Amino acid sequence: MLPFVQERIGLFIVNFFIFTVVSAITLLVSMAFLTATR
Amino acid sequence: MLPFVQERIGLFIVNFFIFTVVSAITLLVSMAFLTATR
Amino acid sequence: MLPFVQERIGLFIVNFFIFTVVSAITLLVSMAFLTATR
Amino acid sequence: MLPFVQERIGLFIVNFFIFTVVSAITLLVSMAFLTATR
Amino acid sequence: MLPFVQERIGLFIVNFFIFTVVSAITLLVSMAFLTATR
Known part of the structure; x- marks a missing residue:
């Protein structure tokens, strides 16, 4: 119910x-x- | 009143x-x- | 004196x-x- | 087993x-x- | 020895x-x- 569960796996996302x-x-x-110019 | 409430839902923003x-x-x-070149 | 004060207001910066x-x-x-090309 | 292990070394990644x-x-x-234009 | 030392000064980096x-x-x-085009 309370916050602060996981951050390590989050920052990686x-x-x-x-x-x-x-x-x-x-x-x-x-x-x-490149297609337009060439 | 104290800090540190939520971070998981924040990092996602x-x-x-x-x-x-x-x-x-x-x-x-x-x-x-593309419009200018072409 | 100790670390860990606020993060919510930081990540928003x-x-x-x-x-x-x-x-x-x-x-x-x-x-x-656009100015150079056109 | 519990979460919250390291964040300092993570945010640097x-x-x-x-x-x-x-x-x-x-x-x-x-x-x-540059190759296309020139 | 334990993790979690500072994050505020890190996220700013x-x-x-x-x-x-x-x-x-x-x-x-x-x-x-600009040099190539012009």
């Missing part, structure tokens, strides 16, 4: 989650941009 | 919040850039 | 702080790039 | 981990883009 | 650290890209 997004932006941009 | 921004930058840039 | 930066990069880049 | 990604996006994009 | 990187990517990209 955001860390790995941001990696997936930060990759999509650099890879997706390169594909769309 | 930033995680999901950054996802929305990191997406807007890659999608918004692609739209404006 | 980085969350909102990153939003301001991630916006400047997408908006600033679009302005400089 | 994401901090340093994001640095490696945020660098790959700016360096990788510059290489692919 | 990543917050300020990411700012320095997120700036280098937008400023470095603008310099290299």
Whole structure:
């Protein structure tokens, strides 16, 4: 009922989650941009 | 009155919040850039 | 004197702080790039 | 068995981990883009 | 010997650290890209 259950397994979620997004932006941009320019 | 109430529900806010921004930058840039180039 | 005072109000700082930066990069880049290309 | 073991060494993982990604996006994009444009 | 020493001063490291990187990517990209295009 009380708060403070787990944090170790939580902080890992955001860390790995941001990696997936930060990759999509650099890879997706390169594909769309490279196709337009070239 | 004392601090330390909840952290689990907090760390999730930033995680999901950054996802929305990191997406807007890659999608918004692609739209404006692709239109200019093409 | 002892550590562990507040974390809830802290984690919110980085969350909102990153939003301001991630916006400047997408908006600033679009302005400089769009002007050069167009 | 109980939760809450370590957080100091954890928060450092994401901090340093994001640095490696945020660098790959700016360096990788510059290489692919600069080659196409030039 | 036991864990849990400080977190307030830690969470601030990543917050300020990411700012320095997120700036280098937008400023470095603008310099290299603007020079190539223009």
